[model samples]
Target: SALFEPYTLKDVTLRNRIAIPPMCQYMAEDGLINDWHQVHYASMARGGAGLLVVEATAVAPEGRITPGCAGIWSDAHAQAFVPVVQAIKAAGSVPGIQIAHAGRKASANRPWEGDDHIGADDARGWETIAPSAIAFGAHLPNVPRAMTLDDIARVKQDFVDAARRARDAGFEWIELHFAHGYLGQSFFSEHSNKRTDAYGGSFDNRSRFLLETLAAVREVWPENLPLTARFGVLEYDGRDEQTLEESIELARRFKAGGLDLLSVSVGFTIPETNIPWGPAFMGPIAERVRREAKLPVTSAWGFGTPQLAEAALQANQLDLVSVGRAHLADPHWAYFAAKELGVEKASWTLPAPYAHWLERY
Candidate 1:
């Protein structure tokens, strides 16, 4: 089946096309991984995902979305991932990570908690930074400090440092988290960014930060490894055509800048938009980006079902299917997909221990 086929990019080859995208556990303490993460990642790897990208790890302390968000800001923080990487590799899955900065969305409580901005009275909250001083409004009402030119340079260096650390930690694939209303996504969207400097306004100015940061990380990330990014191609807010047009243009630039794959997604720039959610909704959008920009693309939102994932691959809509929540519900989702899709000897998708017993059943 196409879903179980192997894919190679650069020097890394995936055993199958199933990829587990970054999903924040919000379970870390002081930006360090513990047994929760080690077991969490290894279990998914053992379940048969070709690539398992760990959660969005902040590049700096203040960039964390919440206190529990994992980070790679320090050597110790990066060191914690070494064991996790080894576990994923031992299970025959390629380990990857998404490095990020939350910008104005920083200093928030975990989702199960209030899921709101940290109040001024809370000692855990810190000042957030963005291209402009605007607040995200609604649950995130804190107005971030308008980043100075020096702040821009500092953050870019932080991304570079994080990339170096990720490489040292033995991550085979590195994805820059430029999506989901984070700092990079906010910089690209006109709604959240109202700056008058070179980092805002026109399309080129808005794209400058993401482009520059990708180039900087490229310098450090190995050429033989897949260097990719998750970027919001459009906001579901009424203006999708113009937004998609500009996004495709930026994707071309990314390919030119040596980007290996583009994880196409929607720009969750603001809280005020009607997002039409449905199964395999991003398939057509990802297909367009792949065709127009002439680059490989992957997208996630609703391709959780085995048939939906197989259809997307067969239709050439995506190079890889990113399944998230389903894995949370079942770590052996790949084995489930194998059985549902009627792959030969589906039980073998699991390790010999489980496969041996399951096959005898």
Candidate 2:
């Protein structure tokens, strides 16, 4: 399948197809990274991923999904990431960070605590802003304040500032969190964004904020570093919300805006039973986007098996395969895969401390 073939983007090279999708640990205090995040991410580097994205760190203090989410809105937050970034890079994985503004989804409780909305009056929550005044409608009942033009400028600047912080922290890659019903997705999705301003309405207008934000980030982000966007690629069977064709067009636009890669995934309108929930269910959408947009693509949903991952790479359907829960179960999946395929000296995938134990066991 040639999944073992190395792939390079700018100055960073991924040794294989395996990527550790950024998964929130919900362990930060006041948006600052602590020892817990260091261990959480370092272990993934030792687990043999070619790329490790730090969880969705907020671009603004009030943009966090919960109080425990990591942030890079300030220099202090960047300082906290230095050791973690160094550990991942030293261990042979490209370290990256996902910077996001949760938008209407911000100011919420952690998933373990029922994933409800926390009010502004709550000690851990504050007011959330989105493109339109709408609530996510789970336990989140408070309508979000519609962002003004000034708010848009501030948010874009926040992304730029965070990109600079990421550079200072020694990250080689940066992914804009434009997916999962967050701020970027809100602007693109018709169901979420009901505004008539420049950030909403026609395709070009709706895409303005994301492109502007990317341009802002790229200005500060190193040219040698890879910058990607994890986009929701919103889908509707026959509705006007967002079609697959529209998503492909959007990817093309993003590429034109200087994005290096597209981490494509589907679904975000609302949780529905129709969403196929198994290995590689979302691969087709990713493949279509990659093929049509003529851009490198990566996907996360249900890519659990090595066979499927390899097949996707072999077909050139995806440039990278991101493992989420599968990695949580087996940290050494990449090393084990190299061995199972009879590759020599595959133990190099693991950290020195674990390599000896892995070989012995």
Candidate 3:
């Protein structure tokens, strides 16, 4: 099946459909990748995934949702990512990074740390910004400051700057963090954005920020590299019924703007919802968006089994299947799937040292 075959985007190619979805380790301090991150990512690459995406790395210092999140706001952050990217690529996986801005969701504690809003008095607390002055609720109670025109321009430049740094850090794939009620998601949801300016109201207006940011990032990002965006395909309660259609249009706009792929997901407007959690949970939305936009797509939300993963690919549902928490639970998922399919030399995908151990085990 094509699911086990190599997939190419721009100048980079992945050996299989499996992608180690960007999962946050929450170990960064002041936006720097510490040793914990290096080990965490190195193991995934060694575990035989075709692509290893670093977590939602903030593009600016103030853009982090928690104190220990990764950052790419400056040259220092880029320098910190170099060894990590080099290691992942050396292990045979395409090294990718997801650059993000937390927006109104910034300044919160880790999920296990109460998931509450950190007050100004706390050492990690900081001010947050968004398209509108709204809070994400849950434990995030403080409303954010609506970004001014100047702030918007600055944020766009931050994305551009982060892309440039990502290139220097040797990452071949870039994913724009536009989902999960974060900065970019805030602009797309009508329930969150109440602005009366060029960046609010209608679909075109609400999409301005992300579109403009993509254009800016494309200007600095190399054409040879794959640039992708992860978007929230659904708005809670169908409040923005046009979000999916608009998102497909947005994908078209992105392709027109020179983007290479769309990593589609849903359910960010209300993250606290009781949606059932299981394999292939959100693959259909990505498949629909892919069909509508006529572009390559990646689906990540609960694709964990070999049969289901291959089924999605065989059905022309997605070009890539991202396994997030599943990979964390079992990094050798790709190798195991190949074995189950009766493929020889599955160990070829992993680093020599790791593959040798896997074979011996």
User: Which candidate gets the maximum TM-score versus the true structure?
Assistant: 1
Off by over 4 Å in 2: 119-121, 236-242
Kindly list the per-residue Cα lDDT of model 1 for residues 1-361, writing each as its tens digit: 9999999999999999999999999999999989889888999999998999999999999999999999999999999999999999999999999999999999999999999999999988999999888988999999999899999999999999999999999999999999989999999999988999899999999999999999999999999999999999999899999999999999999999999999999989899888889999999999999999999989999999999999999999999999999999999999999999999889899999999888777
Residue pairs clashing in model 3 are: 280-302
Write the number of the candidate with greater TM-score, choosing between 1 and 3: 1
Q: What count of clashes does model 3 give?
A: 1
lDDT of 3 at 245: 76
Query: Which consecutive 10 residues in model 2 have the weakest lDDT in total?
Result: 234-243
TM, every model? 0.99, 0.95, 0.95
Off by over 4 Å in 1: none
- Give the least accurate 10-residue stretch of model 3, judged by summed lDDT: 267-276
Lowest lDDT 10-mer window, candidate 1?
A: 352-361
Off by over 4 Å in 3: 239-241, 271-276, 354-361
| Top-lDDT structure, candidate number | 1
Residue 46 in model 3: shift from native, Å? 1.1
**Candidate 2, 35: how far from true, in Å?**
1.2
Q: What is the lDDT of candidate 2?
A: 0.85
